[PDB]
Scaffold this active site. Structure first.
Site, short mmCIF file in Angstrom:
data_model
loop_
_atom_site.label_atom_id
_atom_site.label_comp_id
_atom_site.label_asym_id
_atom_site.label_seq_id
_atom_site.Cartn_x
_atom_site.Cartn_y
_atom_site.Cartn_z
N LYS A 188 -46.40 64.71 -15.80
CA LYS A 188 -46.17 65.97 -16.52
C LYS A 188 -44.78 66.04 -17.16
O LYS A 188 -44.64 66.43 -18.31
CB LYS A 188 -46.36 67.16 -15.59
CG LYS A 188 -47.81 67.43 -15.21
CD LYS A 188 -47.92 68.66 -14.33
CE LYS A 188 -47.05 68.53 -13.09
NZ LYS A 188 -47.03 69.79 -12.31
N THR A 189 -43.75 65.67 -16.40
CA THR A 189 -42.38 65.72 -16.90
C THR A 189 -42.14 64.66 -17.96
O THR A 189 -41.44 64.91 -18.95
CB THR A 189 -41.36 65.53 -15.76
OG1 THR A 189 -41.59 66.52 -14.74
CG2 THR A 189 -39.94 65.67 -16.28
N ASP A 205 -47.55 63.17 -9.56
CA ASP A 205 -47.17 61.82 -9.97
C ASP A 205 -47.82 61.34 -11.27
O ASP A 205 -47.68 60.17 -11.63
CB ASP A 205 -47.51 60.82 -8.86
CG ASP A 205 -46.64 60.99 -7.63
OD1 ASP A 205 -45.41 61.13 -7.78
OD2 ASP A 205 -47.19 60.99 -6.50
N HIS A 238 -49.40 77.08 -7.35
CA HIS A 238 -50.40 78.09 -7.66
C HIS A 238 -49.82 79.51 -7.55
O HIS A 238 -49.80 80.25 -8.53
CB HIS A 238 -51.60 77.94 -6.73
CG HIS A 238 -52.70 78.92 -7.00
ND1 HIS A 238 -53.84 78.58 -7.70
CD2 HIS A 238 -52.84 80.22 -6.67
CE1 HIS A 238 -54.63 79.63 -7.78
NE2 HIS A 238 -54.04 80.64 -7.17
N1 LIG Z 1 -47.22 53.08 -17.13
C1 LIG Z 1 -46.91 54.39 -17.16
N2 LIG Z 1 -46.19 54.92 -16.19
C2 LIG Z 1 -45.98 56.25 -16.39
C3 LIG Z 1 -46.42 57.04 -17.43
N3 LIG Z 1 -45.99 58.35 -17.27
C4 LIG Z 1 -45.32 58.33 -16.15
N4 LIG Z 1 -45.28 57.09 -15.56
C5 LIG Z 1 -44.61 56.73 -14.30
O1 LIG Z 1 -45.21 57.46 -13.25
C6 LIG Z 1 -44.22 58.31 -12.61
C7 LIG Z 1 -44.36 59.73 -13.13
O2 LIG Z 1 -43.15 60.45 -12.97
P1 LIG Z 1 -43.09 62.01 -13.23
O3 LIG Z 1 -44.04 62.66 -12.31
O4 LIG Z 1 -43.29 62.21 -14.69
O5 LIG Z 1 -41.69 62.45 -12.83
P2 LIG Z 1 -41.33 62.72 -11.37
O6 LIG Z 1 -41.95 64.02 -11.00
O7 LIG Z 1 -39.86 62.60 -11.29
N5 LIG Z 1 -41.93 61.54 -10.50
P3 LIG Z 1 -41.18 60.99 -9.22
O8 LIG Z 1 -40.40 62.15 -8.65
O9 LIG Z 1 -42.21 60.66 -8.17
O10 LIG Z 1 -40.37 59.83 -9.72
C8 LIG Z 1 -42.89 57.63 -12.91
O11 LIG Z 1 -42.65 56.60 -11.96
C9 LIG Z 1 -43.12 57.07 -14.31
O12 LIG Z 1 -42.35 55.90 -14.56
C10 LIG Z 1 -47.19 56.45 -18.47
O13 LIG Z 1 -47.66 56.99 -19.48
N6 LIG Z 1 -47.39 55.09 -18.25
#
Ligand SMILES: Nc1nc2c(ncn2[C@@H]2O[C@H](COP(=O)(O)OP(=O)(O)NP(=O)(O)O)[C@@H](O)[C@H]2O)c(=O)[nH]1
Lengths: 363, 277
Positions: free
Chosen positions: A17-18, A14, A54
């Site tokens: 990374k993506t 969470d 891993h």
């Molecule tokens: N404020 C803030 N929120 C972020 C940032 N990067 C990611 N997020 C939030 O934190 C979460 C990260 O999602 P991410 O892991 O990249 O994609 P994912 O694997 O699809 N997450 P998920 O499946 O749980 O939505 C998302 O809800 C995104 O909006 C950042 O730099 N700042």
């Protein structure tokens, strides 16, 4: 042609990374133009994968997928390191990733400066506890999301990260710049000329007049290259990637064997015993149907030939099933030219049932 | 509220940095109260994760005399499955299941729900005590194939090494019956009609097909039963032959494998990145 660098992201599911990878590609395109992702900086071309698992990463690092030249550890600044952050870094040390850069994400959600320092300090210490240089590690404070939305202040942080990829990860060494090595496939004698061995130059350059060592299987021998040729046409030099025939002075063809290696003198040694990371093909991937046990006596295929070896399983392991990946100590029945990182196939009756990588040479 | 105090609360709970400061601030600096408040907050953090597929994790086994427990605890990634905190939790659950002879997973779930929640709050992955089973026997042995597969075997007249080998065999060969005669007549009847149907449409004459299917039934019951399978360590004999050789008998077995019956989520990194671009 600009240098190719293989990188990867690792971190909590969470922590972004993506989103980071999306921000990187977007910002680098917006600035420089231009299952993996690719992006460009003015000096380098990047290939970027994710490391969600891993065992999954180890298996791909074995079955062919490029090994990371560097990893980006993504830690959200809101949480700081998770307990499993240890496992993320431990993977890095296990697969021997040589450099780790840290991206502190979600800094757009943490006001307190003193808390950011506590997060950074925790990260540097975790890194150092697994013998990465925590004090020297580049740690970028950013926001992947805000950068992805076009906020200039945070786009700069993506560029800062790209800068460290460019400067903190050493330029990957081209094969042609490495010391000469040629896996021997065939050997012919040409009356009047001498002995010729054939193969594809794995790395470096072989030129007429240069000394070579013949390494593996038998006692190492020295010789001199008295000619290089391709398709019965004499070259002045053979280069990495070319299929050539190397003419040798003095050596008789009974003194050279398939599986031996031609090499720049002093640059590679023969060994019999080593640690390795091994992956065993599943049945669906065309592997064994049944598990094997401690007395398993397969062939280890190095470059051009099989070498029979016995195995030592880790303590607590008495069985290996198809689809497993494990560590094992191998003892070959005779030496073969090898160094850390050398890939091999595992075969039985001439059929590939697995693959591995030399992790540590022992004897 | 200072960085030192926030550091102390994080040191005690492993909770996220910002969660710690927020909790300490609302507690006005009381560490113990901040902790109690995070119990409330943690339940909702766990709830948000509860929808996440947790298809990784560990199988654990523990034997206590004539009683043995096998256990599955799931998480989302194998990074967490290897973690010491997750491991200690699964071990604690395992210990309690054995000590109290707890075979109702809902009872087990209920006892550890608050600890589970505290763990999810610091690890940030869905964690679930998925299933538990007990095996009872005269002689019990276990086998762990890593954390991925666990087996319990109950036996009679068998030493430690023999029991272990059979458990290893069960881990690899996945029988679902002890002996071929354990397969019910109803099951065999249905399977007979299946094979006869297949054989018929392939153009085999009825009289030939019926004889061939009769042979396939002996194959079928031998393949799903422990004693009828070839011994993985010496496939020239069946497990049944092996047991007769040692004047031994298998009275029960259970095999858990992590993620059985959970649909594996197929992820595409490049695509998910492209979408965000
Ligand atoms: N404020 C803030 N929120 C972020 C940032 N990067 C990611 N997020 C939030 O934190 C979460 C990260 O999602 P991410 O892991 O990249 O994609 P994912 O694997 O699809 N997450 P998920 O499946 O749980 O939505 C998302 O809800 C995104 O909006 C950042 O730099 N700042």
């Amino acid at each position: 042609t600009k240098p190719h660098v293989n990188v990867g992201t690792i971190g909590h599911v969470d922590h972004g990374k993506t989103t980071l990878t999306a921000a990187i590609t977007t910002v680098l395109a917006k600035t420089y133009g231009g299952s993996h992702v690719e992006y460009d900086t003015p000096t380098r071309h990047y290939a970027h994968v994710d490391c969600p698992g891993h065992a999954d990463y180890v298996k791909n690092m074995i079955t062919g997928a490029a090994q990371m030249d560097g990893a980006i550890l993504v830690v959200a600044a809101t949480d700081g390191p998770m307990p499993q952050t240890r496992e993320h870094i431990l993977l890095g040390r296990q697969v021997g990733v040589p450099y780790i850069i840290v991206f502190l994400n979600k800094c757009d959600m943490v006001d307190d400066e003193e808390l950011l320092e506590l997060v950074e300090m925790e990260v540097r210490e975790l890194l150092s506890q697994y013998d990465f240089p925590g004090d020297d590690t580049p740690i970028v404070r950013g926001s992947a999301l805000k950068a992805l939305e076009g906020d200039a202040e945070w786009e700069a942080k993506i560029l800062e990260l790209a800068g460290f990829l460019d400067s903190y990860i050493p330029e990957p060494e081209r094969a042609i710049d490495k010391p000469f090595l040629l896996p021997i496939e065939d050997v012919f004698s040409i009356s009047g000329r001498g002995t010729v061995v054939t193969g594809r130059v794995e790395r470096g350059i072989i030129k007429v007049g240069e000394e070579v060592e013949i390494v593996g299987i038998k006692e190492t021998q020295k010789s001199t290259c008295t000619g290089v040729e391709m398709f019965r046409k004499l070259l002045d030099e053979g280069r990495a990637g070319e299929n050539v025939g190397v003419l040798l002075r003095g050596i008789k063809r009974e003194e050279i064997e398939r599986g031996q290696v031609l090499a720049k003198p002093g640059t590679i040694k023969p060994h019999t015993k080593f640690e390795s990371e091994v992956y065993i093909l599943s049945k669906d991937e065309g592997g064994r149907h049944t598990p094997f046990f401690k007395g398993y006596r397969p062939q280890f295929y190095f470059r051009t030939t099989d070498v029979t070896g016995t195995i030592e399983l880790p303590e607590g392991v008495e069985m290996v099933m198809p689809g497993d990946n494990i560590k094992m100590v191998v003892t070959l029945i005779h030496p073969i030219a090898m160094d850390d990182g050398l890939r091999f196939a595992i075969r039985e009756g001439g059929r590939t049932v697995g693959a591995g990588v030399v992790a540590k040479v022992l004897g | 509220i200072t960085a030192s105090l926030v550091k102390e609360l994080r040191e005690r709970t492993g909770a996220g940095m910002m969660d710690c400061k927020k909790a300490l601030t609302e507690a006005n600096g009381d560490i113990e109260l901040a902790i109690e408040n995070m119990r409330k907050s943690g339940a909702i953090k766990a709830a948000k994760k509860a929808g996440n597929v947790a298809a990784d994790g560990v199988i654990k086994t523990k034997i206590d005399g004539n009683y043995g427990i096998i256990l599955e605890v799931n998480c989302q990634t194998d990074f967490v499955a290897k973690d010491a905190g997750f491991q200690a939790f699964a071990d604690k659950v395992l210990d309690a299941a054995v000590a109290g002879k707890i075979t109702d997973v809902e009872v087990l779930k209920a006892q550890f729900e608050e600890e589970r929640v505290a763990l999810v709050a610091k690890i940030g992955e869905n964690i679930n005590i998925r299933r538990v089973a007990a095996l009872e026997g005269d002689v019990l042995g276990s086998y762990q194939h890593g954390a991925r597969i666990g087996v319990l075997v109950a036996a009679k007249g068998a030493d430690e090494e023999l029991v272990k080998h059979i458990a290893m065999h069960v881990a690899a060969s996945k029988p679902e019956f002890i002996k071929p005669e354990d397969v019910s007549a109803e099951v065999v009847e249905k399977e007979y009609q299946v094979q006869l149907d297949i054989a018929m449409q392939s153009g085999k004459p009825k009289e030939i097909a019926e004889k061939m299917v009769e042979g396939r039934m002996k194959k079928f019951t031998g393949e799903v039963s422990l004693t009828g399978q070839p011994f993985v360590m010496e496939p020239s004999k069946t497990v049944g032959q092996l047991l007769k050789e040692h004047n031994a008998e298998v009275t029960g077995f259970i095999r858990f494998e992590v993620g059985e019956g959970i649909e594996k989520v197929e992820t595409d990194f490049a695509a998910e990145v492209a979408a965000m671009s």
